[PDB]
Amino acid sequence: MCDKEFMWALKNGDLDEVKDYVAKGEDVNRTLEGGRKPLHYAADCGQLEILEFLLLKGADINAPDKHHITPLLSAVYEGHVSCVKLLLSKGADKTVKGPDGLTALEATDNQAIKALLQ
Structure with a gap:
């Protein structure tokens, strides 16, 4: 229950709720909905403040295994890229689980995402 109030937090930036x-006790790696992680909604729309939060605790920054994809690319096709920046600042490598050179290359064409390719 409260599954919405919990995910609805990573959405409207209610960083106070997450x-x-x-x-409680370091819990940043639970199947949010049924196969995602509490870092996709935060990255895609976490006011860029929520992602750094639940990320500094554990590290779903790479955990993703069935998602065959890490959350840094989640922000790529989001136009936010404000997170991908302070993100690699923690490591998140650059291509730890994407298909291949997709990352910024086959992702888009703006100089902001390509910025992570620097």
């Missing part, structure tokens, strides 16, 4: 769940 801070309550992790305030």
